[PDB]
Design an enzyme around this catalytic site. Structure first.
Site, PDB file in Angstrom:
ATOM      1  N   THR A 181       0.826  -1.201   0.000  1.00 23.47           N
ATOM      2  CA  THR A 181       0.000   0.000   0.000  1.00 23.47           C
ATOM      3  C   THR A 181       0.864   1.257   0.000  1.00 23.47           C
ATOM      4  OG1 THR A 181      -1.825  -1.092   1.176  1.00 23.47           O
ATOM      5  CG2 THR A 181      -1.766   1.317   1.216  1.00 23.47           C
ATOM      6  N   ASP A 195      -2.693   4.136  -5.113  1.00 19.62           N
ATOM      7  CA  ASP A 195      -2.794   3.019  -6.037  1.00 19.62           C
ATOM      8  C   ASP A 195      -4.037   2.198  -5.715  1.00 19.62           C
ATOM      9  OD1 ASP A 195      -1.911   2.057  -3.630  1.00 19.62           O
ATOM     10  OD2 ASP A 195      -0.350   0.757  -4.460  1.00 19.62           O
ATOM     11  N   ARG A 223      -3.943  -1.299  -5.538  1.00 17.62           N
ATOM     12  CA  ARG A 223      -3.598  -2.654  -5.119  1.00 17.62           C
ATOM     13  C   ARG A 223      -3.956  -2.890  -3.657  1.00 17.62           C
ATOM     14  NH1 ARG A 223       2.380  -5.075  -6.081  1.00 17.62           N
ATOM     15  NH2 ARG A 223       1.597  -5.094  -8.235  1.00 17.62           N
ATOM     16  N   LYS A 263      -9.169   3.098  -2.754  1.00 15.01           N
ATOM     17  CA  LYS A 263      -8.615   3.536  -1.479  1.00 15.01           C
ATOM     18  C   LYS A 263      -9.198   4.884  -1.067  1.00 15.01           C
ATOM     19  CE  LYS A 263      -4.234   1.000  -1.548  1.00 15.01           C
ATOM     20  NZ  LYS A 263      -4.268   0.338  -2.882  1.00 15.01           N
ATOM     21  N   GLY A 291      -2.517   1.085   6.094  1.00 14.52           N
ATOM     22  CA  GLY A 291      -2.426   0.138   7.195  1.00 14.52           C
ATOM     23  C   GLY A 291      -3.514  -0.911   7.090  1.00 14.52           C
ATOM     24  N   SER A 348       3.691   0.729   3.235  1.00 15.29           N
ATOM     25  CA  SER A 348       4.973   0.037   3.160  1.00 15.29           C
ATOM     26  C   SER A 348       5.890   0.699   2.139  1.00 15.29           C
ATOM     27  CB  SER A 348       4.753  -1.437   2.816  1.00 15.29           C
ATOM     28  OG  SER A 348       4.167  -1.577   1.531  1.00 15.29           O
ATOM     29  N   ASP A 354       8.420  -1.138  -4.566  1.00 16.84           N
ATOM     30  CA  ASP A 354       7.947  -1.968  -3.468  1.00 16.84           C
ATOM     31  C   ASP A 354       6.999  -3.029  -4.005  1.00 16.84           C
ATOM     32  OD1 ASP A 354       7.360  -3.123  -1.070  1.00 16.84           O
ATOM     33  OD2 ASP A 354       6.226  -1.435  -0.251  1.00 16.84           O
ATOM     34  N   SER A 386       2.797  -2.683  -3.350  1.00 15.06           N
ATOM     35  CA  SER A 386       2.085  -1.622  -4.043  1.00 15.06           C
ATOM     36  C   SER A 386       2.159  -1.870  -5.543  1.00 15.06           C
ATOM     37  CB  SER A 386       2.659  -0.243  -3.693  1.00 15.06           C
ATOM     38  OG  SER A 386       2.476   0.040  -2.316  1.00 15.06           O
TER      39      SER A 386
END
Lengths: 219, 213, 216, 199, 123, 204, 198, 201, 197, 199
Positions: A1, A17, A19, A33, A47, A129, A166, A169
């Site tokens: 995320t 994003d 995902r 989101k 989170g 993250s 990452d 994400s």
């Protein structure tokens, strides 16, 4: 995320994003989101997924109460105060992390809400993250009071970090732009993944499944 | 303090055709949620007919690769012959047990041609067990690839469907698309795909791109 | 084993006929920043170099072992030199035996090298993870400078010493912001066909104006 | 986290570091730790930044009512008991430690360390992890009744050397100077940080 | 310690040390044995003592186990070491394998010792 | 752990004008099973169904609570509830327990009580609403269930391709999961009808 | 661990259980009665922690008797299950969760005989047969062999002993004393308690 | 993972499943647990798969050594006896191995069970593995000391059927090995699922 | 927890061992003999952790067999337990401590029939009767009531049935089959195996 | 536990504290932590007192055997290497930390931090739990090119400042100065300690 946002001359922008994963696999590629609170106010979660959901709903529910009772515009920082006061009742035990931004009568206000209740005023920040990689682009190339066009293009290259840098994400990027004229929403502004194709297709004719028992209830 | 190994991700799948054996894996190497590099080939060729990928902790892969090659060429000069694909299996199994008290964490998949010319696949485990199978997987995405393996290669759970022996054209469709599907949902796979195919003439290797995220 | 002299991020990037390696001069004991002048980078013969992270104590011991090994070939006069590969190969294997003996040297090292027009850059870990990439970072620099490098490497895979070092100047500029254990002093080591050339300590000009934009 | 407060006649000098670190990573490289509890009453945030901000509003809340009853701004020592009585009750739940400073029409400049729910008055007070390394530093150069601008420089010198020595602290210098006619606000850029021994 | 070769070759190829060893074998008392049909029988002559020795220690017919026995002719010195360490092998074989000892199994381990003692350094 | 303790799985895929939902029939504690008669899919009324997976403790418990709160809303309004409305009902029923969380993973599927519109969703212990136009998978075999559904799914599917697709998935999915098994029940909501078909599956 | 078993027939439900209650290394009493009479046509068994069995049983047992007085007619087996489960699941979140493994038997006026299975996790599963305790490891494989939905009650008694005597031949506990009760159209009837003439 | 074997006048029958899983996730359905040692000696597998492979192959060497030594075709009891020794050397170092020893000698079709600690147990009827408890019940209902080779397989089939049926960790396909004087023979490799419809109706 | 029991009469030593070897909830081998023979007039009975029983018993067993071959005579029952104690005590502090509780019985031309008790810590004791395991609670208390130094070997086995039946009644674990042996100057004498049909 | 070293032109200055503390109860309040490695070479003990004394004699031995072979005092760099090679070898079982300083007829005064087993060359070095708070004072006060008396000023004042804050540091100062002429010794008594701001 990976979620991030920035403030430009005429307003604010909130990137995110699509995902969603369960720390091993992607739950949904298109999962949204950014949420809706007030006509001029938006927010996005991080989170723990659902901990942002109900928190923004209970916050937005108090808005329409507040709004319709006052008959006045919605204060940005008021939404930020609701959240952290609601989150501090849980002593940070909730893993929800939020970013609040929008437009009030005064001017653009973009905040960030940490799980334990800590908050900060700032032009740009990233959470989740992949926050690290996404921050690196916004640190070096940021300019004071950017133009909307240059601000949107900066968000494009911004999330490119969190996506490509990452694992937690990815997907597409839904741009969110807010000015004093009203609310504006975009979806799938950039598509970093070309290989959406496949070299083999499985389509089976009816009767290829060995069904055992059957019953039919007409409506 | 100190952890003897950490899970680095990665996925390796090897299918053995009738007279051929195809081995394909990505180049993506990561640590936890952090990415190292997008070019990190897992498949390591040993002899003409032998190529082996190793899925697991990457540092333990190199040490085995050196110790194997150390025994390979030592076998060569001493025994005046190369090791067969089946001979390397039992060799590395004894190598893994010597370290049993300090287990190497890896998923070892041997591939190549046997003495009869058929494609052979030997799947290992960190404790050193070994078996032979037509199609094997490894890593994190190995759990997600099994239904597609039990369908195209396996032909299970269908009603009166002819069983065709797998072909190279289907394999290139199969092996890529299962990785195309795995790289999407699994975070530990993607960024590239390398394919190692060995025939009676020698090795044939090519690389096909995957999604960049 | 103990909190002993922990290091910082280590950055490196390939360019045409050379390798740029940069590291801070700050040693760090625990959360304290204690030793602000130390030598992270060592010249290995003409064509090779080494720099590291993690424990600086354990590094000097292994830093000293390389020196005695380089003397062995120099005394022979065989007409050959240690390649960056072999040094990267010896280092991965030597640090590997430390893991099997349950006394691992805790470090993260980067090896620059130049061989016959092909510049080799390599990465190792305490646990023995090794590979080759045109852009290598260590610690939180892998979370910051690494995506910034790969953003430029897509548009410019081939680079010269001009933009390479100038980009590295911008890389460690972020390491002040989001990396708390970084420090102003840093070293820039460039390996070319003329051998290793290590410039002295340098600084970086940064822009803090984000502070005055809060009250807006 | 490095916070510093120094008392003199005309007012107080309250310094702080802009860097806030979560573990080994920085939350925000520039973050203002100065949150006014009352009009002329300010607080220095330390420990957990979250819990310190929640106490700041509960304080400011109680200060509002109590400030409206007297028709006079509550004294600095009054707000010290407020923050402490809330901290001492929650001391097991709330691990944040605040350094209270301010100025009033009566007592003047007052700095009260509230760490661990206690109450004390001091000529100069410092808190946090990075405040430890400057103990001996300030002790050599501290003299009673220094000029306000040099007191502003004294805090500017101290914290600047702390940020270089402390790995968990950094960023830019904040300066809070309270006077009778208002409150002074200063943010010193990283290029303007006082230059000390480099090697 | 003491490390050197004892038995070495000769210009004619025969072993000086080993031939003198078999010479001392013939210098000992005469012992005989046969393999019967359903049994086995051993025997050895006794040098005639005059009204003195006890026959407990003089007996040259011993038993390595319930299944296997033995007799010896030669220097009485080296005979007792072989008898002791062969009985150790008899119990070690039963300790390693539940099955009882084999006459051929125990015999080879015995003569194998004398081969080691010949080619070992200092023995 | 606790989620994989008692096992179970559920799958739902949305076609063009129709939607299907399926779940395994196996019930048992860890290594030893019990019986196939445990029902993981319950009727919510016309063109609305719900699946359940995870620990079977709160499966049957949430169920009786769902129809409870539903029967109130049923009579209070002259018309039946929509699936999108029920999605928040399950999420709120799980969220009030957030600090003593239920163990389940609800899945809802059905059609729009107006005319044709299908809808599906999925939840978790936290109960995050998730809307997908293709499929939703839940269980201990979930990792295996993403494999087939990515490959098999089609932009537009009749009831024919609907029943074929989701059935091939569950039959292939469960093969690799030793915890799930013991047959799969399939439900399909047509425009004018609704069907229920029990699949012949591997016995293990 | 104590063992429970039951079998649902077309007109009947036959239940059998061990009467031995033990603690530490010894068996205190061999006559302990697990079988509890809930109502005319309904009967209940349980196993679990030594004290929670008798404690929790009387609550579900007597609460059904209160219903029988108000409406004049006793509950159906189906109504008893869901009323037992929800009441058992409520005690889980309290300070004293009950360890419970039980078998519910009863004769409905329409469905006839019914057998229900629940565990200390309060999971209701309708099944023609069920087992509890460590014996469920060594027994239920025998039922799937010899059991059919059309089985007669006398075949069940035979096959019952074949499952029961397996415990002394293999399983470590003794458990010699067993009890047998059955419900039919005429309600609860009793059969000779199974013993093992050692 | 279920392994059972039992001794009877006509020799021994070995019946195991093919599924060896890691955790709740199935590794491979077709895993072959039964290991070959000699033409007349047959090994098994339980617990750790690699510990069964290595040691029985090391024992296979030991079986060849003595056979290349005294050529006596070492007895089945001495096999597990040599196996007990080598296992007791590393006892306490973490080796967990279940297994069985099958073979024919002058004494007869010897059957022996070997534990991780070196426990050596002969007997008529054995079993082991995770779900072994489900095997004892169905196997112990009825017994004939002299087995008809056909119905003996059915008693071995129906065992594995209902055993693997209740256990989640037991499954895959049936593996069956008869024991004979000269050498063992593999009876069949058969799917477990399709054997239900026979017993089910 | 398997159960051993033994009784030393004036002219005899009566020993009894449970034949059940079980693992988890099932009995591996219910008739497995735990009684081992050290020599003609001296046996040994061991109970404890599974592998420790079999393995360690061969040490004492094979080494005593080596003694008789050298000196032409068997060890005395006293020397037996001594040789058994030191070997168990030397290996107690080693890398592999053994868990075993053993009764050592034997006969001598002077000391007569002897019975020696030993724990898992290799503490030797000389008692007329002793038992191992949890069953020693339900049994040895009965022997205290009915035992006399003059008791005949006939009433011995007659008395032992009273202690063994309590294992099937009160005691939880099955232990259906029991092995019984007795040793005197005439050597080992096997007796009936008590079972409850 | 506080030790200090400062480099200047003709030599170096090495200070030490006399308090040997274990726990909150002082074990021995008067001790001389200076352990001679040689006539012209000294070391500064820190950390665990007992474990540090053993390394000192093991170093003073290996150095003495090498000294008489060449009939010349070994280089200061050679002294730090012997300390490092012994430390780094046993560093897992020894928590002791040392500070090496000396003078030679070639290089001159040198100071090499051996802390934790590493090696570093610094113009000034500090160590121990008491030196943790003097990082501020050492930066502003220190300037290069000071005479031995001016060095002892900066040396004594920094140690006199150290022992005030630290609970585990106290007692009296033991000074050592090695130049081309020889070794000097100065003992600063508690009353002779320069007094700093105590308020």
């Amino acid at each position: 995320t990976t979620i991030a946002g920035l403030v430009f001359q005429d307003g604010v922008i909130l990137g995110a994003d699509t995902r969603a994963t369960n720390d091993s696999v992607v739950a949904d590629k298109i999962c949204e989101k950014i949420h809706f609170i007030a006509p001029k106010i938006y927010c996005c979660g991080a989170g723990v997924a659902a901990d942002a959901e109900m928190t923004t709903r209970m916050a937005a529910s108090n808005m329409e109460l507040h709004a319709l009772s006052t008959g006045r515009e919605c204060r940005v920082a008021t939404v930020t105060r609701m959240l952290r006061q609601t989150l501090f009742r849980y002593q940070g035990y909730v893993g929800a992390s939020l970013i609040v931004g929008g437009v009030d009568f005064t001017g653009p206000q973009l905040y960030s809400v940490h799980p334990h209740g800590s908050y900060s005023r700032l032009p740009f920040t990233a959470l989740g993250s992949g926050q690290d990689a996404a921050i690196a682009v916004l640190e070096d190339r940021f300019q004071p009071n950017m133009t909307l066009e240059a601000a949107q293009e900066l968000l494009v290259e911004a999330i490119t970090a969190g996506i490509l840098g990452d694992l937690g994400s990815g997907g597409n990027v839904d741009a969110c732009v807010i000015t004093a004229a009203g609310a504006k929403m975009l979806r799938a502004l950039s598509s970093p993944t070309k290989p959406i194709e496949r070299s083999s297709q499985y389509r089976f004719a009816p009767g290829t499944t060995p069904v055992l028992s059957q019953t039919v209830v007409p409506l | 303090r100190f952890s003897p190994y950490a899970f680095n991700g990665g996925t390796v799948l090897a299918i053995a055709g009738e007279d051929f054996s195809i081995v394909a894996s990505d180049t993506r190497l990561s640590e936890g949620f952090s990415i190292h590099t997008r070019d990190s080939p897992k498949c390591y060729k040993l002899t003409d007919k032998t190529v082996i990928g190793c899925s697991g902790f990457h540092g333990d892969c190199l040490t085995l690769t050196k110790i194997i090659e150390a025994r390979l060429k030592m076998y060569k000069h001493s025994n005046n012959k190369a090791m067969t694909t089946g001979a390397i299996a039992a060799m590395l199994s004894t190598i893994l047990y010597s370290r049993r008290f300090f287990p190497y964490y890896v998923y070892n998949i041997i591939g190549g041609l046997d003495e009869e010319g058929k494609g052979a696949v030997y799947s290992f485990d960190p404790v050193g067990s070994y078996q032979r199978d037509s199609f094997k997987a490894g890593g994190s995405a190995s759990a997600m690839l099994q239904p597609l393996l039990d369908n195209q290669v396996g032909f299970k759970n269908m009603q009166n469907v002819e069983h065709v022996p797998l072909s190279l054209d289907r394999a290139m469709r199969l092996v890529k698309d299962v990785f195309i599907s795995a790289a999407e949902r699994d975070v530990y796979t993607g960024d590239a795909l390398k394919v190692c195919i060995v025939t009676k003439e020698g090795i044939r290797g090519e690389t096909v791109p995957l999604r960049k995220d | 084993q103990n909190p002993m002299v922990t290091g910082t991020s280590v950055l490196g990037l390939k360019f045409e006929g050379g390798v740029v390696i940069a590291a801070d001069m700050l040693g760090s004991y625990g959360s304290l920043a204690r030793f602000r002048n130390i030598s992270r980078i060592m010249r290995v013969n003409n064509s090779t170099m080494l720099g590291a992270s993690g424990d600086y104590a354990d590094f000097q011991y292994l830093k000293q072992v390389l020196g005695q090994m380089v003397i062995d070939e120099e005394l022979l006069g065989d007409g050959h030199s240690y390649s960056p590969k072999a040094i990267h190969s010896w280092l991965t294997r030597a640090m590997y035996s430390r893991r099997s003996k349950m006394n691992p040297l805790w470090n993260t090292m980067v090896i620059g090298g130049y061989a016959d027009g092909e510049s080799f850059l390599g990465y190792v870990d305490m646990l023995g993870v090794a590979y080759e990439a045109p852009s290598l970072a260590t610690g939180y620099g892998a979370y910051l400078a690494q995506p910034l490098l790969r953003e430029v490497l897509e548009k410019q895979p081939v680079l010269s010493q001009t933009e390479a070092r100038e980009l590295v100047e911008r890389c460690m500029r972020v390491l002040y912001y989001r990396d708390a254990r970084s420090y102003n002093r840093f070293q820039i080591a460039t390996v070319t066909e003329k051998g290793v050339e290590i410039e002295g300590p340098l600084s970086a000009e940064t822009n803090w104006d984000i502070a005055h934009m809060i009250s807006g | 986290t490095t916070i510093m407060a120094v008392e003199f006649d005309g007012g107080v000098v309250v310094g702080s570091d802009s860097r806030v670190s979560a573990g080994e990573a920085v939350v925000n490289r520039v973050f203002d730790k100065l949150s006014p509890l009352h009009q002329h009453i300010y607080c220095a945030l330390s420990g957990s930044a979250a819990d310190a901000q929640a106490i700041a509003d509960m304080a400011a809340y109680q200060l509002e009512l109590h400030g409206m009853e007297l028709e006079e701004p509550p004294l600095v020592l009054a707000a010290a008991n407020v923050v402490r009585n809330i901290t001492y009750k929650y001391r097991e739940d709330l691990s944040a430690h605040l350094m209270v400073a301010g100025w009033d029409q009566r007592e003047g400049g007052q700095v009260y360390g509230t760490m661990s729910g206690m109450l004390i008055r001091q000529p100069f007070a410092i808190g946090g992890s990075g405040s430890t390394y400057i103990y001996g530093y300030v002790d050599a150069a501290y003299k009673p009744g220094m000029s306000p601008e040099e007191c502003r420089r004294f805090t500017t010198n101290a914290i600047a050397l702390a940020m270089k020595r402390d790995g968990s602290s950094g960023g830019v210098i904040y300066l809070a100077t309270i006077t009778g006619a208002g409150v002074d606000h200063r943010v010193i850029l990283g290029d303007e940080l006082p230059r000390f021994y480099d090697e | 310690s003491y490390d050197r070769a004892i038995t070495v070759f000769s210009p004619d190829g025969h072993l000086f040390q080993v031939e003198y060893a078999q010479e001392a074998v013939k210098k000992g008392s005469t012992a005989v044995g046969v393999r019967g049909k359903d049994i086995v029988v051993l025997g050895v002559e006794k040098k005639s003592v005059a009204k003195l020795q006890d026959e407990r220690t003089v007996r040259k017919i011993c038993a390595l186990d319930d299944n296997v026995c033995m007799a010896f002719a030669g220097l009485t010195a080296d005979a007792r070491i072989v008898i002791n360490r062969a009985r150790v092998e008899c119990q070690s074989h039963r300790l390693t394998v539940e099955d009882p000892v084999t006459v051929e199994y125990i015999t080879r381990y015995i003569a194998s010792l004398k081969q080691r003692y010949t080619q070992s350094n200092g023995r | 752990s606790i989620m994989s303790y008692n096992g179970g799985a559920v799958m739902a895929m949305k076609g063009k004008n129709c939607v299907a939902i399926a779940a395994d029939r196996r019930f048992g504690i860890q290594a030893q099973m019990v019986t196939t008669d445990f029902q993981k899919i319950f009727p919510m009324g016309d063109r609305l169904y719900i699946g359940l997976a995870g620990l079977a403790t709160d499966v049957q418990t949430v169920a009786q609570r769902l129809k409870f709160r539903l029967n109130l809303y049923e009579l209070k309004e002259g018309r039946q509830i929509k699936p999108y409305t029920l999605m928040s009902m399950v999420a709120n029923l799980l969220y009030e327990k957030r600090f003593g969380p239920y163990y389940t993973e609800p899945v809802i599927a059905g059609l729009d009580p107006k005319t044709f519109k299908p809808f599906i969703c999925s939840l978790d212990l936290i109960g995050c609403p998730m809307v997908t136009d293709d499929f939703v998978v839940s269980g201990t075999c979930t990792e295996q269930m993403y494999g087939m559904c990515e490959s098999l799914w089609e932009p537009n599917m009749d009831p024919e391709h609907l029943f074929e697709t989701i059935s091939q998935a569950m039959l292939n999915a469960v093969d690799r999961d030793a915890v799930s098994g013991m047959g799969v029940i399939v439900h399909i909501i047509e425009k004018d009808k609704i069907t229920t078909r029990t699949l012949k599956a591997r016995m293990d | 661990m104590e063992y429970l078993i039951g079998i649902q027939g077309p007109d009947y439900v036959l239940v059998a259980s061990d009467r031995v209650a033990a603690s530490n290394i010894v068996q205190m009493k061999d006559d302990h009665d697990k079988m509890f009479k809930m109502s005319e046509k309904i009967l209940l068994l349980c196993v679990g922690e030594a004290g929670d069995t008798v404690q929790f049983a009387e609550y579900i047992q007597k609460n059904v008797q209160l219903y029988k007085m108000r409406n004049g007619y006793e509950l159906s087996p189906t109504a008893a299950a869901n009323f037992t489960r929800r009441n058992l699941a409520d005690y889980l979140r309290s300070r004293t969760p009950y360890h419970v493994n039980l078998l519910l038997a009863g004769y409905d006026e329409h469905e006839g005989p019914a057998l229900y299975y629940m565990d200390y996790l309060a999971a209701l599963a309708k099944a023609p047969f069920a087992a509890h305790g460590y014996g469920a490891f060594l027994t239920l494989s025998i039922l799937d062999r010899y059991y059919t939905p059309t089985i007669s009650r006398e075949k069940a008694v035979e096959l019952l002993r074949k499952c029961l005597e397996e415990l002394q031949k293999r399983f470590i506990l003794n458990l010699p004393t067993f009890s047998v009760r059955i419900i039919d159209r005429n309600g609860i009837h009793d059969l000779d308690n199974i013993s093992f003439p050692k | 993972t279920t392994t059972l074997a039992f001794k009877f006048q006509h020799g021994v029958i070995v019946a195991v499943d093919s599924r060896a899983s890691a955790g709740n996730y199935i590794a491979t359905l077709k895993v072959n647990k039964v290991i070959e040692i000699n033409p007349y000696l047959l090994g098994t597998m339980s617990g750790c798969a690699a510990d069964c492979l290595y040691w029985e192959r090391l024992l296979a060497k030991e079986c060849r050594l003595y056979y290349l030594r005294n050529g006596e075709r070492i007895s089945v009891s001495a096999a597990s006896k040599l196996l007990s020794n080598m296992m007791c050397q590393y006892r306490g170092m973490g080796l967990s191995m279940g297994s069985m020893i099958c073979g024919w000698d002058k004494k007869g079709p010897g059957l022996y069970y070997v534990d991780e600690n070196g426990t050596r147990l002969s007997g008529n009827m054995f079993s082991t593995g995770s779900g072994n408890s489900h095997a004892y019940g169905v196997m112990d209902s009825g017994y004939r000391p002299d087995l008809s080779i056909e119905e003996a397989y059915d008693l071995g089939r129906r065992a594995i059927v209902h055993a693997t049926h209740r256990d989640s960790y037991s499954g895959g396909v049936v593996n069956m090995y008869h024991m004979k004087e000269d050498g063992w023979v593999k009876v069949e490799s058969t799917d477990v699922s399709d054997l239900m419809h026979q017993y089910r109706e």
